[PDB]
Amino acid sequence: RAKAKSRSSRAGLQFPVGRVHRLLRKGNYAERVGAGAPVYMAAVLEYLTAEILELAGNAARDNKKTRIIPRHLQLAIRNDEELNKLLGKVTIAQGGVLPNIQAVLLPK
């Protein structure tokens, strides 16, 4: 038998490809899953994951940390307008809120 090779490595991805291929056939979403479907999707999930982690990582650095906590994810998501929206209905456990104080409440 020819040597088996992981597909994630092959597609230049870190996210699993065969599995996504699989998951796309579940929940009864479509009878069949095309070969490029999970490849396309795995790239998307990985991309979005990176964007959140990068921004959260920057938040971690802003707070002089060596890691991401739920709070950093919240700050990252909200500061980034497009992620803010993508997850605009999402409640993050222990996310807190942005420190937005209305100007009319402040003295001179």
Partner 1 sequence: PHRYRPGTVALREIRRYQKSTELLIRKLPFQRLVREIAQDFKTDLRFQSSAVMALQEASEAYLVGLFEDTNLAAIHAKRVTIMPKDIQLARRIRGE
Partner 2 sequence: GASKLRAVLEKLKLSRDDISTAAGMVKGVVDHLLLRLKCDSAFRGVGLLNTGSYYEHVKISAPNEFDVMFKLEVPRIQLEEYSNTRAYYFVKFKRNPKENPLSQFLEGEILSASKMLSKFRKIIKEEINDIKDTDVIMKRKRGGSPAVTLLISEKISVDITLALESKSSWPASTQEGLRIQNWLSAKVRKQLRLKPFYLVPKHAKEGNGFQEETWRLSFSHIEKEILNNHGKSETCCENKEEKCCRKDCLKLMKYLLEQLKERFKDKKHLDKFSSYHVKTAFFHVCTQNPQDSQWDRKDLGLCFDNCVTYFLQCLRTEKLENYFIPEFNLFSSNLIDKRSKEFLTKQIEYERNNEFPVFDEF
Partner 3 sequence: RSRKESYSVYVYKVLKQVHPDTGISSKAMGIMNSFVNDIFERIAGEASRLAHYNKRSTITSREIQTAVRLLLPGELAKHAVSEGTKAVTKYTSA
The residue from 45, 53, 58, 68 that contacts partner 2 (CB under 8 A) is 58
Q: How far is the CB of 107 from partner 1 (least distance, A)?
A: 7
Number of neighbouring beta carbons within 10 Å of residue 66: 7
Q: With binding defined as CB under 8 A, does residue 16 bind partner 1?
A: no
Q: With binding defined as CB under 8 A, does residue 94 bind partner 1?
A: yes
User: Cα separations (Å) of 57 from 6, 97, 104?
Assistant: 28, 18, 33
Cβ proximity to partner 3, 12 vs 107, nearer residue: 12
Q: Judging by beta carbons within 10 Å of its beta carbon (0-12, 13-18, 19+), is residue 61 exposed, middle or buried?
A: exposed
Give contact residues for partner 2 (rule: CB under 8 A): 54, 57-58, 61-62, 64-66, 80-82
